[PDB]
Design a protein around this ligand. Structure first.
Ligand SMILES: Cc1ncc(CNc2cncc(F)c2)s1
Ligand SMILES: Cc1ncc(CNc2cncc(F)c2)s1
Ligand SMILES: [Zn+2]
Ligand SMILES: [Zn+2]
Length: 583
């Protein structure tokens, strides 16, 4: 305990020797509280003007406008230790699942070279400012790496000095860049080498992309079974048990040499024992500790969430199939039965699921799954917005299943070929495009973010009448050659490019689409179909409203307003790619 965190604590305590005070009115119960010290400082959303000026009808939709305005009593929760039978079910399943993921993969260390490219082309690794300004600067230096080396040698010693989280249903724990590297060195392979790919994991979708998710849900639908189940967990990261953290750590069993010790240290020191600096305006910096809950990089979090979610869902399948009778204790015969289930049908059972971190869709063997709730509830993976022992409401139609904030439509092209297209409430799409994260943006940068959104809409949401039109308008209003930008790059972002959008559509939807047998390129945008105009209205379209018809009719005037603001640049008119504007 304090042997493992004390060094980290004692080091912080000393850098504020004229401040340290053990405030006796600290609000922590579930989190251990060590002390405090003096600080004073805070990033709200800004509106993207290029997008808003070209989406005027939406200036009066409260669902769009409210998205741009404005529980920490959930992070301070505690989950009960699972029963012995639950713990055995999890240990056995975790062992078998690491083996399966490892069959065609080699754990390996990631390198500074790799980490250095990441920071120069910008991911969201989540660092802090201090001694160097940006993340870009500290990597270019040589002193930072000497710091890294020190901590690394300490990790091999089995101690830790500077790996401390900073808190800030979305609470992010940013770490200093050095700690991020040591985490990425040890565990980056999980993301970098696609361990949770559909090919390697059977349930996973890592790197598959929105244009593939709908086809994958449909492939699951083709299996014999009962309803499709899509239970969200109530605050998944706050319900990761120490038992989950120990079963994740069994990935080190597949490692060797330096890598194995470095990985064990990350699991032992930064995951199974955590030290966090949280601000408290009453402004002190509280130094609290905790062994449980999900702390890690957003990207290792994703891989370990997918892993533990796969594990829980295999066990819920086992329960619905009556592989084990009770979670209180597992008979020696029940252990063998579980083990032989995994060996005999485990891979088939994984192919019945689509899992993206804390998000899942299961098509179990039959509807017994709906009331198989004892293992799920005991593991602490308590379902959101339904009573604890109330049976799951399944879905009969794969086109109604929620997954990764989307639903999927089946859409028939004029030539018989079949698109499965992603979709969500259009107010959600327009409200997100109207928002820029960070201030300090030039007109040019703001314009290039709008163009990223426009190109995503043309690629993913082309079947929505208002999004094809607004996307054509934004791309007409931003200089033809200006490059699309984004301040967090997830899966596959084929819209981040200066190439012709019809050429990308053809590559993504026809050429590279393994569900399309005929590879005939499409020759214009008019070949590319829309949802039915009632289906479009159901998913939030403004077609049929007066405000919308005036906007479409007078779009060239909105385009010209934005062209005037940006200035005398080279523009393309994309509106004639649509039938109604083609004279
Ligand atoms: C790291 C990931 N790999 C695939 C994912 C599936 N989810 C998704 C959501 N939004 C846009 C996407 F391209 C994909 S998440
Ligand atoms: C219920 C409605 N019936 C026709 C409408 C007009 N909206 C529209 C726009 N572009 C292409 C279309 F097929 C239809 S709204
Ligand atoms: Zn450390
Ligand atoms: Zn829809």
């Amino acid at each position: 305990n304090l042997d493992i965190i004390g060094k980290r604590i004692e080091k912080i305590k000393q850098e504020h020797e004229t401040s340290w005070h053990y405030d006796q009115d600290h609000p922590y119960k579930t989190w251990a509280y060590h002390g405090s010290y003096e600080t004073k400082q805070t990033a709200s959303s800004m509106v993207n003007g290029v997008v808003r000026l070209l989406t005027k009808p939406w200036d009066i939709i409260p669902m769009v406008t409210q998205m741009a305005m404005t529980f920490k009593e959930k992070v301070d929760t505690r989950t009960q230790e699972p029963k012995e039978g639950t713990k055995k079910l999890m240990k056995i399943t975790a062992e078998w699942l690491w083996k399966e993921l490892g069959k065609k993969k080699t754990p390996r260390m990631c390198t500074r070279e790799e980490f250095t490219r990441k920071v120069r082309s910008n991911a969201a690794l989540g660092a802090i400012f201090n001694k160097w300004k940006s993340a870009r600067e500290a990597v270019e230096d040589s002193g930072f790496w000497e710091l890294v080396d020190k901590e690394r040698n300490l990790h091999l010693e089995g101690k830790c000095e500077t790996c401390v989280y900073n808190m800030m249903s979305r609470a992010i724990w940013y770490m200093w860049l050095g700690a991020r590297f040591l985490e990425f060195e040890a565990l980056g392979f999980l993301n970098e080498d696609h361990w949770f790919s559909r090919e390697n994991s059977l349930s996973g979708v890592e790197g598959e992309g929105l244009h593939k998710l709908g086809y994958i849900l449909r492939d699951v639908s083709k299996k014999e079974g009962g309803a499709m189940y899509a239970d969200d967990t109530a605050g998944w990261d706050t319900r990761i048990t120490l038992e989950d953290l120990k079963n994740e750590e069994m990935v080190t069993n597949h490692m060797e040499g330096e890598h194995k010790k470095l990985a064990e240290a990350i699991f032992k020191l930064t995951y199974q024992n955590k030290v966090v600096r949280v601000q408290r305006p009453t402004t002190v910096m509280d130094i609290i500790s905790r062994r449980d809950q999900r702390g890690s990089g957003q990207v290792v979090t994703y891989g370990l969430n997918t892993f533990t979610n796969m594990e829980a869902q295999l066990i819920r399948q086992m329960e619905g199939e009556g592989v084990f009778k009770s979670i209180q204790h597992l008979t020696v015969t029940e252990e063998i039965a579980v083990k032989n289930w995994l060996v005999r049908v485990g891979r088939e059972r994984l192919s019945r699921m689509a899992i993206s971190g804390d998000d899942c869709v299961v098509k179990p063997l039959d509807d017994r799954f709906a009331s198989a709730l004892t293992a799920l509830n005991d593991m602490g993976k308590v379902r959101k917005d339904i009573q604890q022992w109330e049976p799951s409401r399944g879905w009969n139609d794969w086109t109604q299943v929620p997954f990764c904030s989307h639903h999927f439509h089946e859409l028939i092209m004029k030539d018989g070929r079949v698109l499965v297209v992603p979709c969500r409430n259009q107010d959600e799409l327009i409200g997100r495009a109207r928002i820029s994260q960070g201030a300090g943006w030039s007109l040019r940068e703001t314009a290039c973010l709008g163009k990223s959104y426009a190109q995503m809409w043309s690629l993913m949401y082309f079947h929505r009448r208002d999004l094809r039109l607004a996307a054509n308008a934004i791309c007409s209003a931003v200089p033809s050659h200006w490059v699309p930008t984004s301040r967090t790059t997830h899966a596959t972002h084929e819209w981040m490019t200066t190439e012709d959008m019809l050429t990308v559509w053809n590559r993504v939807w026809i050429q590279e689409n393994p569900w399309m047998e005929d590879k005939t390129p499409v020759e214009s945008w008019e070949e590319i179909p829309y949802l039915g105009k009632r289906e479009d209205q159901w998913c939030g379209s403004l077609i049929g409203l007066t405000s919308r018809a005036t906007w479409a009719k007078n779009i060239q005037t909105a385009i010209n307003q934005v062209r005037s603001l940006i200035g005398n640049e080279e523009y393309t008119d994309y509106m004639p790619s649509m039938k109604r504007f083609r004279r």
